[PDB]
Amino acid sequence: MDVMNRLILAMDLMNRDDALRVTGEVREYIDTVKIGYPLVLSEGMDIIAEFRKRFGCRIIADFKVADIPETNEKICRATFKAGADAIIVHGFPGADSVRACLNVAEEMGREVFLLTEMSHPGAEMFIQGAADEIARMGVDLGVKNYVGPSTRPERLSRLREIIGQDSFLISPGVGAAGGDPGETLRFADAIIVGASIYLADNPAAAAAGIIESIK
Amino acid sequence: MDVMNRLILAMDLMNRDDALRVTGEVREYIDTVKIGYPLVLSEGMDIIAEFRKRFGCRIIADFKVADIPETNEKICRATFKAGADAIIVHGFPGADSVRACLNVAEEMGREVFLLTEMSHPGAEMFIQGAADEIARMGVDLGVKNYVGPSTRPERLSRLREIIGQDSFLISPGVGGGDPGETLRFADAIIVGASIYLADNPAAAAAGIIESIK
Ligand SMILES: O=c1cc(O)n([C@@H]2O[C@H](COP(=O)(O)O)[C@@H](O)[C@H]2O)c(=O)[nH]1
Numbered sequence: 226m227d228v229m230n231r232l233i234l235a236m237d238l239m240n241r242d243d244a245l246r247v248t249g250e251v252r253e254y255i256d257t258v259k260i261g262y263p264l265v266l267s268e269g270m271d272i273i274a275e276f277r278k279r280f281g282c283r284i285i286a287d288f289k290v291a292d293i294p295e296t297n298e299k300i301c302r303a304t305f306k307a308g309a310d311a312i313i314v315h316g317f318p319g320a321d322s323v324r325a326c327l328n329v330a331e332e333m334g335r336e337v338f339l340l341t342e343m344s345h346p347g348a349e350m351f352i353q354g355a356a357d358e359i360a361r362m363g364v365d366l367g368v369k370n371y372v373g374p375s376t377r378p379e380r381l382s383r384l385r386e387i388i389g390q391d392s393f394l395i396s397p398g399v400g401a402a403g404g405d406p407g408e409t410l411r412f413a414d415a416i417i418v419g420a421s422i423y424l425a426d427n428p429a430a431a432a433a434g435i436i437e438s439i440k
Numbered sequence: 441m442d443v444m445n446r447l448i449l450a451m452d453l454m455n456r457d458d459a460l461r462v463t464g465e466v467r468e469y470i471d472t473v474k475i476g477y478p479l480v481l482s483e484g485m486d487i488i489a490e491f492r493k494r495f496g497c498r499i500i501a502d503f504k505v506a507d508i509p510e511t512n513e514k515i516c517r518a519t520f521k522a523g524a525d526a527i528i529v530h531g532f533p534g535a536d537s538v539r540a541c542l543n544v545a546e547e548m549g550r551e552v553f554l555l556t557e558m559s560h561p562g563a564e565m566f567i568q569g570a571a572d573e574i575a576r577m578g579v580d581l582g583v584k585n586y587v588g589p590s591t592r593p594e595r596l597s598r599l600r601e602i603i604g605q606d607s608f609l610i611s612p613g614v615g616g617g618d619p620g621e622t623l624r625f626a627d628a629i630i631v632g633a634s635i636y637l638a639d640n641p642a643a644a645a646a647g648i649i650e651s652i653k
């Protein structure tokens with residue numbers, strides 16, 4: 226995927242009018258938008274096609290798919306039919322669950338991103354300990370796209386080592402309570418930024434500032 | 441939670457007309473319906489209030505919530521605002537992620553179910569090893585409702601030991617797990633396709649209910 230400015234917008238506003246306005250304002254800097262359940266459950270799956278048409282952006286559906294294989298397939302298919310370019314899926318439910326999502330993505334000409342490790346404090350309890358193994362499972366399954374935490378660069382470096390240089394890696398948890406934009410981009414292909422942009426008084430300026438900091 | 445006949449319908453059909461037809465056909469047996477992303481993503485979140493209105497049933501939103509705290513908070517608010525009586529949340533992402541859902545539920549007067557172990561084969565890779573710790577985490581958080589797999593009776597028994605007798609436990613994967621034995625440990629069983637794909641859902645439900653007593 227070709228992510229403009231290596232910066233992905235996490236559009237987690239839950240009001241259509243506000244989500245549209247903010248996303249529109251930063252289209253000059255960002256052409257790849259991560260849409261998750263807060264927006265989708267508030268405004269409907271139609272919002273994905275609307276965003277694509279209105280802003281001419283790529284959409285990553287951040288649905289953290291985490292069910293049994295048959296249910297996973299149903300979610301993935303519905304999500305791709307709704308126009309998503311890619312979908313983010315959890316690895317902790319096991320290889321069969323992940324394989325199911327890969328089935329559907331292959332069948333429909335779309336992409337799966339595998340979430341191997343998370344950025345919040347609770348990730349220390351069970352996810353961190355499984356992270357290397359989940360990433361290796363991804364490699365064994367032929368996964369090419371990954372999501373991993375910027376909150377700790379040493380962990381992010383280890384992930385990149387597991388998945389190789391050819392794999393695509395995107396990373397959330399950027400900022401004060403997270404990692405540094407520049408440092409993260411030593412290992413990740415793109416960073417994901419949400420509230421710092423969408424709650425900013427001037428979202429366009431917030432985005433420009435982040436891109437400046439990583440010139 | 442009072443589940444009629446200890447039997448929860450997993451309404452995973454993706455067509456509103458068919459979902460409504462089948463649910464109507466078994467309402468005389470089942471008053472508690474699990475609605476997941478397949479139906480909600482196809483037909484929209486409004487389907488939850490429509491089910492509760494049309495059937496006078498309780499709805500468990502099976503969204504397997506598995507994000508960071510701030511995102512889980514948003515998902516739970518939207519879900520409860522849509523009328524869900526309960527939401528199912530993953531424990532694997534850790535305590536703060538679960539706490540977020542619990543706090544929202546408690547603020548809104550709704551319920552959280554903690555999913556501790558899953559029923560499918562891949563569950564053995566990562567989740568099974570963490571399942572008892574996840575249940576113990578839930579217990580300390582004050583979780584009172586749990587989900588665990590009918591396909592592994594020994595695991596289900598241990599989960600019941602951990603959560604204690606006062607906690608509420610529901611269990612899918614029946615087919616597969618046996619209804620009667622599962623109910624030695626679970627308060628209710630969850631059943632999907634063997635009811636909703638049947639020639640006669642009512643009889644299918646009636647049969648299951650019969651095999652229990
Ligand atoms: O480990 C992870 C995985 C995520 O998807 N995310 C997601 O990335 C986004 C981050 O947004 P924010 O920059 O406002 O923290 C949110 O949509 C969140 O759900 C995350 O923060 N950490």
Ligand SMILES: O=c1cc(O)n([C@@H]2O[C@H](COP(=O)(O)O)[C@@H](O)[C@H]2O)c(=O)[nH]1
Nearest residue numbers: 296450452558559612613631632633634
């Ligand atoms: O471990 C689990 C957790 C679940 O929620 N489920 C859910 O329970 C339901 C089971 O449906 P079925 O009886 O047709 O197998 C599905 O909605 C599925 O997503 C499961 O099967 N195993």
